[PDB]
Coordinates of C-alpha atoms (C1' of nucleotides) in Angstrom, one line a residue:
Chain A
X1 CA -185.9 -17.0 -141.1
X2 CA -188.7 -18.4 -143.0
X3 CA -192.4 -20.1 -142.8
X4 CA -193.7 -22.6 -145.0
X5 CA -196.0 -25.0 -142.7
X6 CA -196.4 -27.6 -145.6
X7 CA -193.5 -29.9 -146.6
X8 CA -192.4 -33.4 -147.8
X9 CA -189.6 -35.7 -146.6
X10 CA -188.2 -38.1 -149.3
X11 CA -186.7 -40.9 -147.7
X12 CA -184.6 -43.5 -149.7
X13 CA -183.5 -46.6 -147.4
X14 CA -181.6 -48.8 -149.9
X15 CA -179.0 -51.8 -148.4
X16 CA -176.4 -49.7 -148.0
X17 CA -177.6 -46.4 -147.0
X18 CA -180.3 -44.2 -146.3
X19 CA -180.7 -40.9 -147.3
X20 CA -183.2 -38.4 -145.7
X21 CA -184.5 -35.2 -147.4
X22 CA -186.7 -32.4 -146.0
X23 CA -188.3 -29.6 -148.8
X24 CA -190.9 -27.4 -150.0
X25 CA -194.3 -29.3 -151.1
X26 CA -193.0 -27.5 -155.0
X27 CA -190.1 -30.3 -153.9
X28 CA -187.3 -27.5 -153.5
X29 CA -184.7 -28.7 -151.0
X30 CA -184.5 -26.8 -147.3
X31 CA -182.2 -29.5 -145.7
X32 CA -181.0 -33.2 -146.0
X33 CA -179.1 -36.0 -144.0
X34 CA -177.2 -39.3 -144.5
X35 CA -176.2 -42.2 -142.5
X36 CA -172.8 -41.9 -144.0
X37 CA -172.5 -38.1 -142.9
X38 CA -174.0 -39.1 -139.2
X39 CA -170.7 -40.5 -138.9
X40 CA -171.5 -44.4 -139.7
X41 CA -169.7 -46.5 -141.8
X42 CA -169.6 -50.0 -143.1
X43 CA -172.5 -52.1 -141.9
X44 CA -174.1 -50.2 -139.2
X45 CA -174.9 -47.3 -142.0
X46 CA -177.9 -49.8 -143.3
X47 CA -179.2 -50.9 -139.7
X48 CA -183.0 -49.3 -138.5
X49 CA -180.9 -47.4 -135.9
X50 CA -179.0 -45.5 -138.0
X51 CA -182.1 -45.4 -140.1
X52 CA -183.9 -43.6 -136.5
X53 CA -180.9 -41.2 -136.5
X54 CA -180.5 -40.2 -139.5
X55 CA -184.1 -39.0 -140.0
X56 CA -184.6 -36.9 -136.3
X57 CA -180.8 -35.4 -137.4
X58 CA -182.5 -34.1 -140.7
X59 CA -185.8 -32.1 -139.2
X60 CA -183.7 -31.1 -136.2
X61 CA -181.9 -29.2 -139.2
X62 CA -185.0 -28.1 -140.2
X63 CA -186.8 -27.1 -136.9
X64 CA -186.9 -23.2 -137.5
X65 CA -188.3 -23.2 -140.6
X66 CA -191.8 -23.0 -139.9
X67 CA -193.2 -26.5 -140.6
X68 CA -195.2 -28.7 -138.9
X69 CA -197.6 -30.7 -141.9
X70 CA -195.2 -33.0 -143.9
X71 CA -196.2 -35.8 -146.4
X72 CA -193.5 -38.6 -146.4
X73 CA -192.0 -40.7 -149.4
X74 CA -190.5 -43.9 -149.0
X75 CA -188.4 -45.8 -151.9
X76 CA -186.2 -48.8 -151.6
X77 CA -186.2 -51.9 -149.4
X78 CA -184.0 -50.7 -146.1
X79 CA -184.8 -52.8 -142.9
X80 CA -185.6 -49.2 -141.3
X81 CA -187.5 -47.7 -143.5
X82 CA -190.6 -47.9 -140.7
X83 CA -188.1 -47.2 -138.3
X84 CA -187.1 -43.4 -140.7
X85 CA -191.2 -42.7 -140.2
X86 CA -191.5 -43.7 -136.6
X87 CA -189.0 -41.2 -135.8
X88 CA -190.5 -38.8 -138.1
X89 CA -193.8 -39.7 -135.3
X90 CA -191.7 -39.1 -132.4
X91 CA -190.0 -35.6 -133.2
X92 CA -193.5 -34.3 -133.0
X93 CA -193.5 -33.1 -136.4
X94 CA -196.9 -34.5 -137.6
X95 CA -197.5 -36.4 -140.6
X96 CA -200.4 -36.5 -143.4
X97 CA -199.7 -38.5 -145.9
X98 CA -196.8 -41.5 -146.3
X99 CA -196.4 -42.8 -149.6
X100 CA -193.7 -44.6 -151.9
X101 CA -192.0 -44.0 -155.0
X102 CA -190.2 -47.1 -155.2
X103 CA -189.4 -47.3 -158.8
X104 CA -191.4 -50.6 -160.9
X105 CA -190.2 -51.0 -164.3
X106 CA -192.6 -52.1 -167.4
X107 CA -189.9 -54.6 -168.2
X108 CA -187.8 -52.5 -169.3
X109 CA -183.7 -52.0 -169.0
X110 CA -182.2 -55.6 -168.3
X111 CA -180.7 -55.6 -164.8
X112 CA -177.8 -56.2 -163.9
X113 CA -176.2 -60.1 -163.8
X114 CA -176.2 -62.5 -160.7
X115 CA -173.3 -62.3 -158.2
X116 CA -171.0 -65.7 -157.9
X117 CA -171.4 -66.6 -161.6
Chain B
rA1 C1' -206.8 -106.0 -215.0
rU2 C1' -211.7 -104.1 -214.8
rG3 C1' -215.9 -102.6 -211.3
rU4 C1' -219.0 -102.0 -206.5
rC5 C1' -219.7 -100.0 -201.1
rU6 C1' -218.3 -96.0 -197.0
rA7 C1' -216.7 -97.3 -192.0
rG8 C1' -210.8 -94.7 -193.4
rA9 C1' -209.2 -90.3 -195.4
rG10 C1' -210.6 -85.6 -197.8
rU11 C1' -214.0 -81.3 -200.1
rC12 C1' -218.3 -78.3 -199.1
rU13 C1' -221.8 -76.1 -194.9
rG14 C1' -222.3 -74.3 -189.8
rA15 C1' -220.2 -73.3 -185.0
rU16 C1' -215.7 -72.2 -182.1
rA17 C1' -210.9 -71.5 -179.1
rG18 C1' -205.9 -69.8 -179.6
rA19 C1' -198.6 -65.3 -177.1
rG20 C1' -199.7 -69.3 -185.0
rG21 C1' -196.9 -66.3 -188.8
rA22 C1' -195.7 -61.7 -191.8
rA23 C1' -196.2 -56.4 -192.8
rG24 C1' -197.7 -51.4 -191.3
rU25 C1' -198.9 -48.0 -187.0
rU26 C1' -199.3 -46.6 -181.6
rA27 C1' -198.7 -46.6 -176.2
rG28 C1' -197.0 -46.0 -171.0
rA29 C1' -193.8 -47.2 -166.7
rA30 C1' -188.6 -47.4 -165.7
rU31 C1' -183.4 -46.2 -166.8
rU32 C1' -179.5 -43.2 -168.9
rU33 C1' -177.8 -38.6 -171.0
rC34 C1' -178.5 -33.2 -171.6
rU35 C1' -180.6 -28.3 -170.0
rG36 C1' -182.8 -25.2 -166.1
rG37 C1' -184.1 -24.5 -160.2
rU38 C1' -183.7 -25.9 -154.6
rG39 C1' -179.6 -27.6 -151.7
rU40 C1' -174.5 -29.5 -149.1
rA41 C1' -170.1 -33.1 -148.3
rA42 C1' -170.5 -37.1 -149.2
rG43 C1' -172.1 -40.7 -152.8
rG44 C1' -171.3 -45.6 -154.4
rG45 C1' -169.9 -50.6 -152.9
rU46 C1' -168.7 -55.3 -149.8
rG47 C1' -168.0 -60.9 -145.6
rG48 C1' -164.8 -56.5 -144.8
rA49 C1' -162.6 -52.6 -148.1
rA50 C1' -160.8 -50.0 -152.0
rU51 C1' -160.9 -48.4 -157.1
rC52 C1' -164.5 -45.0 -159.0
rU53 C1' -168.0 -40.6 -158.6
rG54 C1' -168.3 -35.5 -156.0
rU55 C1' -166.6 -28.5 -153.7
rU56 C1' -165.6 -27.5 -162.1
rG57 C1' -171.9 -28.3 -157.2
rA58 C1' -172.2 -35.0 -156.7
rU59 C1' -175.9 -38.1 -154.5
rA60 C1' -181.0 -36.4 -153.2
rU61 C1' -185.4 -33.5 -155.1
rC62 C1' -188.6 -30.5 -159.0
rA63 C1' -189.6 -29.3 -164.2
rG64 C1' -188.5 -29.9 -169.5
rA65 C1' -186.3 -32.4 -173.8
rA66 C1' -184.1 -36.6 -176.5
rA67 C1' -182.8 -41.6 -177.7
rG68 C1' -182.7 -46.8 -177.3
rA69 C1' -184.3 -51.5 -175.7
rA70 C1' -187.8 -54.6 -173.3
rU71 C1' -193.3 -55.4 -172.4
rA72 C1' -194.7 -55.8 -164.8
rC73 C1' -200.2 -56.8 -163.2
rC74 C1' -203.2 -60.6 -166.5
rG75 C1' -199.6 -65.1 -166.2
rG76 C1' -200.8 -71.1 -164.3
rA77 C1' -200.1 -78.7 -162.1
rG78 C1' -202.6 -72.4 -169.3
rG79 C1' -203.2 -71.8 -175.1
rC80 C1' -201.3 -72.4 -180.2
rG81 C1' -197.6 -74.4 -183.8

RNA sequence: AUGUCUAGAGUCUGAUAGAGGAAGUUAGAAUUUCUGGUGUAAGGGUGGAAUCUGUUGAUAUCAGAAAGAAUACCGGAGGCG
């Protein structure tokens, strides 16, 4: 049993999946949830629903400890990713900051090669 | 074969644009690996899956260190050779 009132929520919605963590403002992890653990599979793990679920499963596992003041980051391209903060908005849980991290290269590190050659 | 001229072509003077070339320095983002924290059962991937990665602590997240390669925005019905 434990208060910290300030927090972050990283939130990474690539194609596939989307990953949802909740932790300190230092960035130390209290909790975290995936679309692949809320027992989705194939497809439907990259879809804004699962995206909605995900996200309200994570702070539900985080409701007792103490928090209320959150500042969310976003990376990747997901469909969802608006649908991760919205329910975020409707757990109650309020918000004070949403941001991204998505990661922009310099040119740097040559991708990787188109798909059907 | 020997002269003459300046409009062709050059030299000199002045102005000016430019990723022109070579050599020597420097920079940050991002990625990967390694080390140290938080934390748990998935991660990753496809039309759909599996191989693979992960309970020897993954992915995610924070801090530090190292190396390599390439230079987003400017940046195009541009510029130079």
């Amino acid at each position: 049993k434990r208060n910290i009132g300030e927090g972050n929520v990283y939130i990474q919605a690539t194609f596939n999946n989307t990953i949802v963590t909740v932790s300190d403002i230092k960035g130390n992890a209290l909790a975290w949830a995936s679309a692949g653990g809320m027992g989705f599979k194939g497809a439907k793990k990259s879809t804004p629903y699962a995206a909605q679920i995900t996200a309200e499963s994570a702070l539900n596992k985080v409701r007792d400890f103490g928090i209320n003041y959150v500042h969310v980051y976003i990376k990747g391209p997901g469909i969802g990713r608006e649908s991760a903060i919205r329910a975020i908005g409707s757990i109650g849980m309020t918000v004070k900051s949403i941001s991204d991290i998505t990661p922009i290269p310099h040119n740097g590190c040559r991708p990787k090669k188109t798909r059907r050659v």
